[PDB]
Design a protein around this nucleic acid. Structure first.
Lengths: 195, 136, 120
DNA sequence: CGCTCTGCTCCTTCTCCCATCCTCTCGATATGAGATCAACTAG
RNA sequence: AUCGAGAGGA
DNA sequence: CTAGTTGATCTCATATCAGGAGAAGGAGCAGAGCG
């Protein structure tokens, strides 16, 4: 689930790259003549300011020029009909599948929603099953660096992938950290207990 | 996003080297963030309260600054490294009741003094006076 | 699809057979049966690549099977043995149309007669 | 037996379509000089 | 006013 | 007749992934049929 953080990070990465590009162009058109340049005039703060403002104001997550390409419906206007409406709106989840599709599978209530997503709250119209709401005690992780975990695993009896020979993989336990196969272990039970 | 993602994005950006001979570096190193504020035409730095942003149709945003180092090398590897501190690069809309909102850690009495509802949960932005919520 | 693959497979097959077959078919002339042959229609060439001598050997096996059946059941007449064996061989030739199938049918008949003899 | 004439299936392209009606909010989206002509505007 | 978007109603 | 005034009009000049379905074309092979 991409919350406000990652979405704004995507937008800001794009905007900062554009800002650097504009600074590059402005500096080039000055250094082509030998004369120095003032980076104060090379920085278009409007780039970041207006990009973030536009994306939050219209809900089109992307550049204003590629509005047709951008996904819409992000950044909706907060509902204030009643307090429960506001609370529900602040805990809303969206599947970008596309309401036009007629396959029932993505709209079905999967078993794994237990305790994570409310099984009752969902719009009854064209978006049934695609717009969801968090269960009361559900939480979404913000992420953390795996470096301490990798250091501990190395300190433990885990063997790096380059060192071990391929013959030792068969009976050992592969260890994945954030999808990276980082080594193997011979005593998975004790390792799980320790972790 | 404010604590880590912005700085990580800025640092991950490759420095730009330009050729016309003289060469430039233009490296960004660290970022600063102020609290939401409004400047009138006189330039007095007043704090923008969320209710004022709602009523005057303002954007509740904070200015973002970054330190920039510029170096120039022409001949004989002479280093002209110069630094521009607190360079303004844009404004970041601030989510209400977050760590960097003016309402952070205010008592119910303080919130009512600001014409804010204590029961208001926050978690949204004010863009041109309009309350905006990001859908996961 | 499957029809396209069936024709392509056939194209792959015939050329391999040609590679595995002689430029010209060394036709081994059909051996004419001896006048003492007790095989009905011994001069027929209905079943390709089948020799009269093979039919004689099969009839000999049938004779042995019939002898076993007789000695187990104590059959009285002997001329019936030869006539019955010849009739069985002729029936097998009339039914089958390929050498291997003919031999398999004859062996099946031999097994049937052996089982009947075992039964008594 | 070379060469042509279909013709047969098959893969590729491409173009079309995807209920009705209704409410609301919200964001974005020059100027004059000279020439020509024609109507006067009178002599 | 136009366009688009979104949220809704039956 | 016959020159002078009055308006309109044109030119020119000045900077700086979780569609699908069907119909039309072309492709390559396969064979038939006749010189």
């Amino acid at each position: 689930l991409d919350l406000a953080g990652p979405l704004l990070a995507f937008l800001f990465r794009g905007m900062f790259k554009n800002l650097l590009k504009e600074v590059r162009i402005y500096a080039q058109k000055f250094i082509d003549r030998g004369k120095d340049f003032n980076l104060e005039l090379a920085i278009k703060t409007r780039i970041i300011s207006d990009g973030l403002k536009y994306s939050l104001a219209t809900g089109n997550w992307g550049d204003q020029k590629k509005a047709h390409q951008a996904r819409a419906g992000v950044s909706q206007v907060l509902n204030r009909l009643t307090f429960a409406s506001t609370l529900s709106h602040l805990r809303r989840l969206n599947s970008p599948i596309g309401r036009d599709g007629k396959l029932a599978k993505p709209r079905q209530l999967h078993n794994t929603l237990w305790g994570m997503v409310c099984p009752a709250e969902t719009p009854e119209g064209h978006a049934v099953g695609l717009v969801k709401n968090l269960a009361l005690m559900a939480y979404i992780s913000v992420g953390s660096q795996p470096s301490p975990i990798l250091e501990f695993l190395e300190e433990w009896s885990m063997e790096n992938l380059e060192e071990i020979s391929p013959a030792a993989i068969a009976d050992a336990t592969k260890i994945f950290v954030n999808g990276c196969w980082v080594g193997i272990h011979k005593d998975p039970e004790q390792l799980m207990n320790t972790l | 996003f404010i604590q880590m993602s912005v700085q990580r994005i800025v640092e991950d950006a490759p420095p730009i080297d330009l050729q016309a001979p003289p060469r430039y570096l233009l490296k960004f190193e660290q970022i600063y963030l102020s609290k939401p504020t409004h400047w009138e035409r006189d330039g007095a730095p007043s704090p923008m309260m969320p209710n004022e942003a709602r009523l005057r149709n303002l954007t509740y945003s904070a200015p973002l600054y970054v330190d920039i180092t510029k170096t120039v090398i022409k001949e004989g590897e002479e280093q002209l490294q110069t630094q521009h501190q607190k360079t303004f690069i844009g404004k970041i809309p601030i989510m209400l009741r977050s760590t960097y909102c003016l309402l952070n850690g205010l008592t119910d009495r303080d919130l009512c003094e600001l014409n804010e509802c204590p029961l208001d949960p926050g978690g949204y932005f004010i863009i041109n006076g309009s309350e905006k919520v990001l859908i996961a | 699809r499957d029809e396209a693959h069936k024709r392509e497979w056939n194209l792959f097959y015939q050329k391999q057979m040609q590679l595995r077959k002689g430029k010209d078919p060394k036709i081994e002339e059909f051996v004419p049966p001896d006048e003492n042959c007790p095989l009905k229609e011994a001069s027929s060439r209905r079943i390709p690549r089948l020799t009269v001598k093979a039919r004689e050997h099969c009839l000999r096996l049938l004779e042995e099977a019939l002898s076993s059946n007789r000695q187990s059941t104590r059959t009285a007449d002997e001329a019936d043995l030869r006539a019955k064996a010849v009739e069985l061989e002729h029936e097998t030739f009339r039914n089958a149309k390929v050498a291997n199938l003919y031999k398999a049918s004859v062996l099946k008949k031999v097994a049937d007669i052996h089982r009947a003899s075992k039964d008594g």
